[PDB]
Design a protein around this motif. Sequence first.
Motif, PDB file in Angstrom:
ATOM      1  N   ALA A   1      -6.411  -1.796  -6.629  1.00  0.00           N
ATOM      2  CA  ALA A   1      -5.144  -1.077  -6.699  1.00  0.00           C
ATOM      3  C   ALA A   1      -3.992  -1.943  -6.216  1.00  0.00           C
ATOM      4  O   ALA A   1      -2.907  -1.929  -6.809  1.00  0.00           O
TER       5      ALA A   1
ATOM      6  N   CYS B   1       0.819  -1.206   0.000  1.00  0.00           N
ATOM      7  CA  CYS B   1       0.000   0.000   0.000  1.00  0.00           C
ATOM      8  C   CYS B   1       0.855   1.259   0.000  1.00  0.00           C
ATOM      9  O   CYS B   1       0.440   2.291  -0.539  1.00  0.00           O
TER      10      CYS B   1
ATOM     11  N   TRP C   1      -5.712   5.033 -12.535  1.00  0.00           N
ATOM     12  CA  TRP C   1      -6.078   4.570 -11.203  1.00  0.00           C
ATOM     13  C   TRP C   1      -7.422   5.110 -10.733  1.00  0.00           C
ATOM     14  O   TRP C   1      -7.792   4.896  -9.574  1.00  0.00           O
TER      15      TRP C   1
ATOM     16  N   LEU D   1       1.877   2.615  -3.597  1.00  0.00           N
ATOM     17  CA  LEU D   1       0.865   3.072  -4.529  1.00  0.00           C
ATOM     18  C   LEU D   1       1.131   4.521  -4.932  1.00  0.00           C
ATOM     19  O   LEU D   1       1.837   5.249  -4.231  1.00  0.00           O
TER      20      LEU D   1
ATOM     21  N   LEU E   1     -10.466   2.763  -8.960  1.00  0.00           N
ATOM     22  CA  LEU E   1     -10.004   1.475  -8.463  1.00  0.00           C
ATOM     23  C   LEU E   1     -10.170   1.404  -6.952  1.00  0.00           C
ATOM     24  O   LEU E   1      -9.783   2.327  -6.229  1.00  0.00           O
TER      25      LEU E   1
ATOM     26  N   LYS F   1      -3.234  -4.437  -8.963  1.00  0.00           N
ATOM     27  CA  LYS F   1      -2.569  -3.794 -10.090  1.00  0.00           C
ATOM     28  C   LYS F   1      -1.113  -3.483  -9.769  1.00  0.00           C
ATOM     29  O   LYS F   1      -0.226  -3.685 -10.607  1.00  0.00           O
ATOM     30  N   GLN F   2      -0.847  -2.987  -8.559  1.00  0.00           N
ATOM     31  CA  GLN F   2       0.528  -2.698  -8.172  1.00  0.00           C
ATOM     32  C   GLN F   2       1.353  -3.974  -8.078  1.00  0.00           C
ATOM     33  O   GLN F   2       2.532  -3.985  -8.449  1.00  0.00           O
TER      34      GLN F   2
ATOM     35  N   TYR G   1      -3.282   8.631  -6.224  1.00  0.00           N
ATOM     36  CA  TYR G   1      -4.297   7.648  -5.862  1.00  0.00           C
ATOM     37  C   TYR G   1      -4.486   7.582  -4.354  1.00  0.00           C
ATOM     38  O   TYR G   1      -5.619   7.481  -3.867  1.00  0.00           O
TER      39      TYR G   1
END
Lengths: 124, 97, 118, 244, 152, 205, 233
Positions: D210, D20, D202, D23, D205, D213-214, D27
Amino acid sequence: GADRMSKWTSKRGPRSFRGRKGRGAKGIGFLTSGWRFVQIKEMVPEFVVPDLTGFKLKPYVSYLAPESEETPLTAAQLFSEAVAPAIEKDFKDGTFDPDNLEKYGFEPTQEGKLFQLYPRNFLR
Amino acid sequence: IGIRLTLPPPKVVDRWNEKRAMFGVYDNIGILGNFEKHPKELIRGPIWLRGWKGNELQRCIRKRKMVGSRMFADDLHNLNKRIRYLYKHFNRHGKFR
Amino acid sequence: MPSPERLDKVVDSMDALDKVVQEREDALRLLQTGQERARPGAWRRDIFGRIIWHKFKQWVIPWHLNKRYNRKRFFALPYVDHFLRLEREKRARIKARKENLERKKAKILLKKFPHLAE
Amino acid sequence: PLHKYPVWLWKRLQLREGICSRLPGHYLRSLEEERTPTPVHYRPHGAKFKINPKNGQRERVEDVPIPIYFPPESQRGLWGGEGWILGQIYANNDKLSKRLKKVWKPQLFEREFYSEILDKKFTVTVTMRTLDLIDEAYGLDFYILKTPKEDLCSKFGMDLKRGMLLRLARQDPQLHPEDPERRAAIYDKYKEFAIPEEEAEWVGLTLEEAIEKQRLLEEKDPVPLFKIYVAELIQQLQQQALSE
Amino acid sequence: ARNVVYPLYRLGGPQLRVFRTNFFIQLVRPGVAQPEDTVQFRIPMEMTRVDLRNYLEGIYNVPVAAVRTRVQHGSNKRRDHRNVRIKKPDYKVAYVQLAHGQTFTFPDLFPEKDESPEGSAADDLYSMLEEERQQRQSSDPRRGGVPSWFGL
Amino acid sequence: KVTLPPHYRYGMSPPGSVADKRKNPPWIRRRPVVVEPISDEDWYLFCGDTVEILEGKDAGKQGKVVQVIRQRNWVVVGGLNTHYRYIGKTMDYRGTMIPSEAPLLHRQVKLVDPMDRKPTEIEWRFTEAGERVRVSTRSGRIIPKPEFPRADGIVPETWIDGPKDTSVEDALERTYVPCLKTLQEEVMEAMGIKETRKYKKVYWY
Amino acid sequence: AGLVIPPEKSDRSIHLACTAGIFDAYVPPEGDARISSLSKEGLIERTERMKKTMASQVSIRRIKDYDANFKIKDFPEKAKDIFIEAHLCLNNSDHDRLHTLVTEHCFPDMTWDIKYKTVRWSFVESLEPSHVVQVRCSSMMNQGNVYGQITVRMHTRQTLAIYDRFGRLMYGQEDVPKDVLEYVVFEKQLTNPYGSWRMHTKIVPPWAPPKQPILKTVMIPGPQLKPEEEYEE
RNA sequence: GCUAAACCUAGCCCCAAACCCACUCCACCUUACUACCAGACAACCUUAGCCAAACCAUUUACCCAAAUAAAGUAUAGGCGAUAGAAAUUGAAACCUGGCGCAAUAGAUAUAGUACCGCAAGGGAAAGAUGAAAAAUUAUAACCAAGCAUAAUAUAGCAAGGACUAACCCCUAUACCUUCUGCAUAAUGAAUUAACUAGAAAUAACUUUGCAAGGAGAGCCAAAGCUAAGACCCCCGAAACCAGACGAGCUACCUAAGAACAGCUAAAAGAGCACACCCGUCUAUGUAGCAAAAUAGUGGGAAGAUUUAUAGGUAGAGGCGACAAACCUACCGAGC
RNA sequence: CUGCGUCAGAUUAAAACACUGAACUGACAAUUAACAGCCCAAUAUCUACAAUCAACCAACAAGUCAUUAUUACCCUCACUGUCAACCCAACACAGGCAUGCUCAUAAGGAAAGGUUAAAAAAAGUAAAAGGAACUCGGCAAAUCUUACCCCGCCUGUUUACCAAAAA
RNA sequence: UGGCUCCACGAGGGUUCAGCUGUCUCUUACUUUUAACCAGUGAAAUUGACCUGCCCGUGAGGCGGGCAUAACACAGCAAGACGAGAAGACC
Ligand SMILES: [K+]
Ligand SMILES: [K+]
Ligand SMILES: [K+]
Ligand SMILES: [K+]
Ligand SMILES: [K+]
Ligand SMILES: [Mg+2]
Ligand SMILES: [Mg+2]
Ligand SMILES: [Mg+2]
Ligand SMILES: [Mg+2]
Ligand SMILES: [Mg+2]
Ligand SMILES: [Mg+2]
Ligand SMILES: [Mg+2]
Ligand SMILES: [Mg+2]
Ligand SMILES: [Mg+2]
Ligand SMILES: [Mg+2]
Ligand SMILES: [Mg+2]
Ligand SMILES: [Mg+2]
Ligand SMILES: [Mg+2]
Ligand SMILES: [Mg+2]
Ligand SMILES: [Mg+2]
Ligand SMILES: [Mg+2]
Ligand SMILES: [Mg+2]
Ligand SMILES: [Mg+2]
Ligand SMILES: [Mg+2]
Ligand SMILES: [Mg+2]
Ligand SMILES: [Mg+2]
Ligand SMILES: [Mg+2]
Ligand SMILES: [Mg+2]
Ligand SMILES: [Mg+2]
Ligand SMILES: [Mg+2]
Ligand SMILES: [Mg+2]
Ligand SMILES: [Mg+2]
Ligand SMILES: [Mg+2]
Ligand SMILES: [Mg+2]
Ligand SMILES: [Mg+2]
Ligand SMILES: [Mg+2]
Ligand SMILES: [Mg+2]
Ligand SMILES: [Mg+2]
Ligand SMILES: [Mg+2]
Ligand SMILES: [Mg+2]
Ligand SMILES: [Mg+2]
Ligand SMILES: [Mg+2]
Ligand SMILES: [Mg+2]
Ligand SMILES: [Mg+2]
Ligand SMILES: [Mg+2]
Ligand SMILES: [Mg+2]
Ligand SMILES: [Mg+2]
Ligand SMILES: [Mg+2]
Ligand SMILES: [Mg+2]
Ligand SMILES: [Mg+2]
C-alpha cells in the motif's frame, strides 16, 4: 597489533593493495591488453582560461565604496527581470498562447542540450 | 588530612519565603470542605507513589504494573532484575521464619 | 607573513563570487525545471535502518544489470528495530540531561544575582 | 525517563503520520480491524458459562486461541487456515513423564482449480479442510469472495480476491470477449459481492504494498516555476486590463 | 576541479571543459639540489601531471616539458595532552621541467636590506624602555648596596 | 578556526595571543565565573563613551572606555582604576613601572549625561524615523554611539587606491544583463568555442 | 617571551602617566654652592635667568593656558611640602599614598633599593627658600598628551638612617643633620583632567661633592682569568 | 621544613510535563569512507538454563495495556515447594520540582578516548590562585603515614607503680577469629587516608483517638477497631544455558610456488656431512636474555622433508600417523 | 608508518653519561619511473607424446608453461608504492623471521666504567704415580673400542612447556 | 585360527673387552666471569609490634630457676626463626 585508528591509504598493504588503492585523482583513460594505458583526449579536463588583457577589475575593492544592501537573487526576481517585459509586450500586442513559451525562453526538455540543468553534466 | 582547614561559607535560610509561609495549607481540605477533596489528592509526585505506601518490592511491582510499558529497555530490564532479586531475598532469606 | 589578512580577503572574495554564480545557476534551474538540487537523490533506509539521503551516481548500464549496485542493500531486517529504540532512548537521555542542566544553571544564576529576579 | 506513549502504540502513531496517513480511509480501517479468526485446531466451548462438576457452581469459561505458525510456503497456496502447531507433549500422556517438543504439520495436496470469474486454471497446494470449505461455499469463486482474510490466511488468496473484485467492479469484457451472454451470466451470479473499484483496488495489499502504491500515485514530476510565474503574470495583466 | 562530480563520458561525447577551477598550487623552494630548469610545486591531491601541465600552460602561459609527481606522507607521531595522535596532512609534490631550456631560480623573498627600516619609526613604548635602559646604570660597587636616590 | 574549551575564561589578553595561551592552557579546567546575562539589545556600554566610576579606589571620576568584553560584562576605563606593574623586567634590569587598568562592571560604572556631568539611568527608545537610540530617564535627550576607530584600522577618509585595488566607478558599474543562460554557455559563446558532438544519455541511480 | 609589545592590532593601548626623562637637560652653573651663601645674588640671578629665558616664559604661558588658575610665586612652598610628604612616605613604606605624590618613573628609584631595609628619614631645617629655576613643556601632541616640567632648587638640612635586614646600622647616622643641595624636577600631565604635579627626577651636577662614605669595607674582585688567558694590566 | 594536606565546581541521579535527531560541496557494502559495465543473491520457524523444592526427574512468579476492592478468594499443584483468576465496584491528576550526590560520591565518562585483545569485547585516572596575570614583588602560619632538624649504651610484648632523677628497682605469656582449651610454631594484618557490610510489621507489646462499635466505600468486631513506634547483613567457587567472536599460533586439508653445498655410492623413504628441521644427555639460568633461553654434545638432512603466500573445517564442534595431543603463552572441553 | 635528516630548546632521563646536549620537545625538509602493482572485445572451435645440459639409457609417483575461423577495433604513457638505525615477542629483549648474491668479505661491529686479585659460585686450560679404585650408573671430561641380552621388522610420528619411548 | 624365527636398524632398557682420562686416591696452579672497594642509575618476594641471648624445666628469644651482658659498622656461614620459607603428597 595493527593500527585500526589511522586512515587507510595507498601506502599500507601489499603490492596489490598499494597499486590498487587510489588517492582521489580522476581517471583519464583505460588499460588495454598488455597493461598499456590508452588516454582519451576528451576525458582530460580543458581549462577554459579567457583573455585577461584590458580588464578593469582588480582583486581588491577600494574601501571608498557604498554598502549596498544584500538582496539574494531568486527565481521570481530573475523571471521578472528577464521574461516579464517580453511577456507583457506580447500580451499588449494581443497574440499570445502557451505554445510559444519556447520562443519566450522556456525549455520544455533538457535533452539535446550541451549543458543540461538537471542533472547537470558540466563542472564548476 | 581528611578535614577542611577553612570554615564553610555561612548558609542563609529564609524562614519566611512563599513555600515555608504557605506550607501545610489545605491539609484539612477534606475536613473543612465538605469532603469534596481528599488530602491525598494534594500529593505531587510519581504516578505510582500518589496516595500509597509500601516496601521496596511492593514499590517495584507497582511501578512495573503502572508505567512498565512506558519505561526504556534498560530501565525495564533493571526493574525486572531488581524484582527477581528482592523476591528471592524476601521469600528465602532472613533471621525469622 | 607580511600581510596575512590579504589571504583571508581573497578567500572571502572567491567564496562570494562562487556564491553569486551558484545562486544564478540555482535560479535558472528553478525557473526552467524547478528542481531544488542539481544532483539526483532519494530517501532510503540503509542496512542499519536509518533514513539517509542517497545521492545518485552515474553509470552506463541500468541498475538491474549492475552487480555492485545490486550487492548493496537498501532495506533493514527486523532485528534493527531494538537497536533503533535503544538509540532513541539514548538521545532522549541526553536531551533530558541537557534540559535539566539548563534549568539548574538558571536557578543558580537567579540565586547569585538577586536583581535578575527584581 | 519515561516515553510519552506506551511502546505498543508506536505502530499506530507512525500510521497516523507520513505517507501512511494519506492512505484511503477504508483501507486503513480494514487494516486496523482485528477480528478473531475461526477456530481450526481447537474446539470452542460454545457457552459463556458452564457448571463445574466438582462444586456444582456456574463458572464463566473462555475460548483461548491456540498459536499457529504459518510457514512462508503457505503464502503460495490455500491451506484454509491450517498451519504448523509448535508445542510440548508429556510422554505417554503422563504429567510425571518428560516434556518433549512436538510439531504437528498439515497434509498438503497439489490440486487443480478453475475460476469462473477469472477464466483460468490454477495449480495450488491445498488441504482437505480447504477442499471441504470450497464444497461448503459451492465453488472456488464463492469461497474466495466469502471467506475473509483471517480465514483465507494466504497472500495468494488475497490476490485472487482482489482480482475477482476488480473484475466484478470493472465488468471487464476480457472475460469471454465473444460471449457477452456468458459474461453477464457470471457477473449476475456473483453480483452479490459488488464492490466499488476505488475500494476493491486496495483489497489484500500489505502495508508495504500500500505504501508503494500510494508513493507511485503521488509520484509526479515538479512543475517548472516558469509556467506558474507566467500564469500569475498573465492573470495579473488580465485583471489590470479589466480594471482599466 | 575537486569535490565535484565529473560527468560521465561516452564514445563520441563532448570535450570535457572546466571554466572555474578550485585547484590552488604553491611554488616552493626545493630542499635539495635540483637542476636549473626544475621547479617544485605543492599541488592538491586530486591533481594529476597532465592537469598541472594544462594548468600552467593556460593560466600562467608557462611552457612545460616534463612533470613528475609524488605523495609525501605527513607525520602522525604528534600527541596532545590526551595522548591522541595528531596527523599532519599528506601533500602532493610535483616537479616541472621548463620546455625551451629556460632556467629558473628561487629568489630571496625576505631581503635583509628591505627588512631593515629605511624610513623613520618612533614607537612610544620602545623609546620609553630604551631611554630607561640607557639612563639607568648599575650600582657602584664602592657604595655596597646603599640606595643612590638619597642626595645626602 | 576557533578552539575554545567549553569553560574557557576570558581575560585581559585577547584569546589566541601568546599571553592568553600561557595563562589558559588547553588542559586547564577552572571554575566557571558566573556572569549576569545581558541581552544584545539590553547592553548599552560602547567604546569611546565617557562613563563615571561609582565604586573603587577613585570613585566619582569620569573616563572614556577603551575596551569592552561582553563575555564577562567588563568595561575598561582608560587611566582609571589602575594599579602599577613593572614592565621590561629582566635578570639585570629592575623593570619599568607603568600603570595598568582593572576591569569594571556595568553596575560598577554608570553612564553620564554629556551636557550635565552626573550619572544617569538610560533606556532604549525609538526615534520618529524608527532608528534606535538611548534616552535617559531624567532630562531626556539623545546620546548617540560615540565614533570609534575601526577594528582593522582603515581610514576611508585618508584612503588611497593601490595598484591592485579596483576603482570605485568600475566596482560600481552594472554589467549583468539578466537572461536565461548559464555562465558556461555564455563564456563559450563569448570565446567562440564550438562543440557539435552531443552528450549521450546516461543512467543515474 | 618578550613583554615589550602587547598583542598587536588591538584597540586598547597602554596608557602612560609620565615621560622617560626631562625634555631639555638643565646644566647647573659651577659655583652654585657659593651662590647659596650669596643668598641675595642667588635671588637676583634666578630672576635674571627667568627673565632672559624666553622658553621658560612660553612654557609657563602654555601651563596657564591649560590651567589658568596657576601661580609661580606659591609653587615652591607646595613643591617643598610634596617633597617632604614623599620622603616621609618612605619611613612607613606607604606606596599607596606615595603613588599620589611621586611619578611612576620616580617610584623604582625610591623603592627598589629599600625593598628590604628600614629607613628613618626626617626633615629638620631649611637653609634657603626654593626657587623655580626653569619651566619647560612637552611637545604639542607627541602622542596625544602634553607634559610640563618645572625645575626647583633645594638647599635644606636632612637626616638619613638606613639599617640592614637584621637591623644593624648600614649607612648614615640618625642624629646629626647635614646640608643637602639638589635640583628637583616636577612633572604633570596637563591634558589629563585628573593629573597633578609630582616629583619626577633629580639632577646630579658633575661638580657635586662626593657622598658620605659607607660603614663597611668593600672588595672589588679583579678580572677572573681562564687557564689560556694570562694576566694583563 | 620536605613530601604533602585543604580548596567547589564540572556535571550527574530520581520525578513531572512533553511524543525526539538525522543532505554545506565530495567519498562511503570492492580491502567501507574506493568518480565510471550483463546479473539473479535474499528475512520470517516453541527460548534454554541458573535457582527453589534443602538431592532431582513433573513442577518454580517474570509489564501485556484502570488506581482501590473482591483476594491471596475460587482454582492449580511429585495436591508440595509453590502458582493464582474472573464476574462485580470504580480515580483523581495546576511540569518549571528534591529532609538527591559534590571528583574513591553522583553516569564509565575530561571518554567509550588513552590503553589491553586477532576479534567479539574489556576499559580507566585526573581539576582547583586572584576582581584583575595587560598584578607572577604570587595561591602566609599550623595538620595522616614517610624522612630531616636530632643514630645508639647491660635487660628483654617495651607498659604500669613510681622516683629527685630518661634508664636502673618490682609486676606484667601481643590483637581479631576458630576450636573445650592458643603466646603458641592455627588463620589475617608493613603503615596512613578514604570507601566498605541487618532491608520486611503475621501475631504480640507500648502510647493516642473513638467505642458496641471502629475505619475517608471494600475489612474487622462476643471490647473492639483505627493510626504510630519497634525485628530479619557483606564478600568468595568449580559449574549450567542462550547468543556472538576466533584456523595471522597450532591439528589437518586445498590452490599455485621455493630450498636442499661437498664426498661415497647407487637410479636407494642408502651412508658421512653444511644450510635447514628437530630437541637425547650435561651444565648455566629459575622475577632469567627467555611466562621454556644459552653453550656443548646429539637424530634427520632428495624425502612420510622443510618452508613463504591465499583459502577451508568452530566448540552438543573441528582436527588428530590416539599424546585424552592442538584449536591465539592455564582445553576431560576456547573465548 | 617518519621512528639517531637540518635548525632551535626553560630542555635534560635513554636501565649510566652528556655541553655538539639526544633514539626527548617545537619547527622545516623529504621518497620524482624505466623497477613493481594496476591488464585483455565477442561467439564457436583447437590443445595424447613431461622435466632432468634432453642426446645417451633408465623409469614411475605420469607431470610446471600451444591455438584457429569470423566479426568489431587505430585513441596511447594516466594513477599508486619508493624515507629510516624498521617486523612478531609488554622493553633499544642472547628469542622467532621467506628469498637472491657475498662463502669471507670491498660490507658490518666492540667482549673490558675505574681499581684489587678474599671467600663461595660458573666456564676453560695444565698436572707427579695409579687408571673407574668415585658413583644407583664411565654422569661429565679424555680416547675414537669390541661383543652380547631384552623390546620393536625397518625410515617416520607423539605429550608446543618435566615422559621421543617398549607408545 | 593360534605359535615361533630371521638379516638390517635404534639419542630405546641392561651388560661386557681394551684404551682413555682430576670421576677418585688427594687435590693444586693459572685465566676469564663472578666477587670486594670507588663513581652513576636503581627492583622483588617478605614485613603484628620488637628495646630480637645461653642452659635446664614447663607449655620457647619473650613463661619459671640460674647464667651472660657498654654501643656500633663490614665480609662470610647456613644450626634455628614448624625460615610466609617451598609447593607438593595422604585421608
Ligand atoms: K569510574
Ligand atoms: K611428544
Ligand atoms: K631410539
Ligand atoms: K652457620
Ligand atoms: K604451603
Ligand atoms: Mg574502472
Ligand atoms: Mg569498467
Ligand atoms: Mg534445588
Ligand atoms: Mg549434587
Ligand atoms: Mg475485573
Ligand atoms: Mg567519578
Ligand atoms: Mg608527621
Ligand atoms: Mg626487667
Ligand atoms: Mg547443579
Ligand atoms: Mg552454548
Ligand atoms: Mg584459514
Ligand atoms: Mg594458517
Ligand atoms: Mg647433497
Ligand atoms: Mg636418507
Ligand atoms: Mg615437525
Ligand atoms: Mg631419556
Ligand atoms: Mg644424515
Ligand atoms: Mg601429524
Ligand atoms: Mg593411549
Ligand atoms: Mg590415558
Ligand atoms: Mg589458551
Ligand atoms: Mg611514481
Ligand atoms: Mg613496467
Ligand atoms: Mg630485559
Ligand atoms: Mg634456536
Ligand atoms: Mg666491572
Ligand atoms: Mg694426572
Ligand atoms: Mg665401583
Ligand atoms: Mg674398564
Ligand atoms: Mg664406594
Ligand atoms: Mg656396576
Ligand atoms: Mg658422555
Ligand atoms: Mg621403529
Ligand atoms: Mg629391512
Ligand atoms: Mg613434553
Ligand atoms: Mg623430552
Ligand atoms: Mg628413527
Ligand atoms: Mg655485584
Ligand atoms: Mg655503587
Ligand atoms: Mg615491595
Ligand atoms: Mg640486644
Ligand atoms: Mg609435661
Ligand atoms: Mg625447650
Ligand atoms: Mg625466662
Ligand atoms: Mg652480618
